[PDB]
Design a protein around this ligand. Sequence first.
Ligand SMILES: [Mn+2]
Length: 721
Amino acid sequence: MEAYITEMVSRERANELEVYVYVFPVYHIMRAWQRANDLPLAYNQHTIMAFSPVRHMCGYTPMETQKRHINIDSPFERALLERLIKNSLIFTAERHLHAKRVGHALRLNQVQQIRQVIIYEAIELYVNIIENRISIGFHLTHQFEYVYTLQSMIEQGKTIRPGMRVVHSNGRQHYTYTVENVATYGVTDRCPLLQTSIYQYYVEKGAQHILRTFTRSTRVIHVRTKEQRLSYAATLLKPLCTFETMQPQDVLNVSKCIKLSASKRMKCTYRWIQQLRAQYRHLTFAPNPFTIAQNGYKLDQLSTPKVHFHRDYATVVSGMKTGKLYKGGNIKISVLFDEDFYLKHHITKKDIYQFIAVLQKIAIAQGVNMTISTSTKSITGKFTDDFFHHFTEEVEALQPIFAQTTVLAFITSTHLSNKKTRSYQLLKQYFGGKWDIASQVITEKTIEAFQKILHKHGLKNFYPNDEQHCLRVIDVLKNESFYYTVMNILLGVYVKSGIQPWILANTTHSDCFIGIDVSHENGNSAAGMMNVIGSQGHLIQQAPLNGILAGEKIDDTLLANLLKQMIKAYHTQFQRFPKHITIHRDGFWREHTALVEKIMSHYEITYDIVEIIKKPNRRMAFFNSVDNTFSTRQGTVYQRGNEAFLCATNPQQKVGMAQPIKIHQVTKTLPFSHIIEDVYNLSFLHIHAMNKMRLPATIHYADLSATAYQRGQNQTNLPFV
DNA sequence: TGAGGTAGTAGTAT
Ligand SMILES: [Mn+2]
């Protein structure tokens, strides 16, 4: 009943390894040496490192050669030794375990074949030197390949098209290409760039077992990558297998296969790692090197925080069941009903308004009183099927109608999804973007589910302005699974109209939180800076944060202005300066710390900077020796120095296994345990959803805001539910 | 788009 991680710590030391170093005044030298000598090597700017002497120099003379130990005071040599260890492990895996290097991973034995789709297990490896100790980390994954070549595809009657991505796969070979155009040259005719025919090229390079499969019926396919413009036969190329291109039935089955439980995933990972280390011999490990005791980690268990609605509650769900919201008020809603509901799915405006009435009756028990606007009688029927085909042309005149209100847009899913209409994108970029008008979209699927559940019980006649019937519907929905759908819709409306459903019951150790998230994509790098002003969970402001481009560091001046603005916002809304500010960064802190120090020393505020890593590429679990099963516990921390792994979620077997979060503190103002607890506790502020998110609010809402900003979509401040 | 979880969809040959 002990904790495990997917890491190993070597029993040697970084400076106790005897390595050979060559210095040149150099990729091609290393390639020639690997070709001639069959050894693992590594390179850097002008240095080559090896575990054994290189016999054949291939006509190259280094100035000096040493057999020695590395200097652990130089990042250069530590990185070089890490590369050498990684390459030696890859070399061992390729020779003694039958692995292949595909992309950045090692393909392993095939595990399942589903309708001309092959699933291969894979694994990827990481090497780091942590204070004169060598640590090896490893992650399991999956890969997919077809069975049929392009020659079989052209035989079956299909047509090859430009822009399709294809793969050349053999033993110890793997290459990725894009189809340019099918050529009519044929194998017999000489290829223009090849200076001869494909058959002649292969027979010069060795006929082997490839020319035997060649025949005059095969075709020649051009290939376009970068500028090389390769070209060869259709017998060797295969279409790429990826979840995007796979057929929906294959997508369903393959997704059902690559979603393994904790036990299967961890047992497979450890089985292959033990097989690999039975052949590796440059480093040694314990008989069981996978426990956290062997890795130097400390184990801590966190507890669930309490939340505040009007009294303290153990969980969010119970508080939402039988509580009143932290900050209620009045909400002015509207309706955007398209006649396509009635035309295609036989849903009338009367049923929509009965649904909205049930929403109002649910909301009134939570201290929220929302009323329908009176400007929904002039237009009557305006959102016809032709309206959505001219949304940009017909949207301008509707602004006075929907001014200062929250729009409940009832739009059919086809209009939202179809590329000709693009209802969701245009609706968001107009309402929330140009007019700052919140809106919650509901598709016909939700209303059809509601009607089906009504039909299951006694529908009767839902009279308008009837209390007994709406109370009965509320009671029947109380035990339904559609209840969470209703509650998520209501929470979205609340947050988009300035309602705060709950806060943290207890105050955090820090006084204020600032979250930075840069999500660089294409040629426009938008970002979102937050300020969770409360140590209780409140939000005060947000930032545009879009000048930065190409995902580099934030400019010093803009960062200075943004922290100044955030501090001023705290001072104005609290009438005092905060004692301590904790900064959460999404990714790696690449900003300049001197400006932060100067700015927050001018105001006499202590600060801490914390990095949160969304994808640590590691997995943690508890092994139960009695039953031989791996499990996971929410709120588990592995601690080593100023780095930690946190389990902040509890999924079930049908979806997979929990993803840990990695936390890294780069300052020393506060204890690390307090920082870990704050990160965990800010993840219970999912005021938009009934079920729990994994990241803390400072960066979850930051990534949502940045995503909204890139797409072009104290008053309302979180209109992105 | 009712919402989250996870896991890949991610993050020198011719
Ligand atoms: Mn939403």
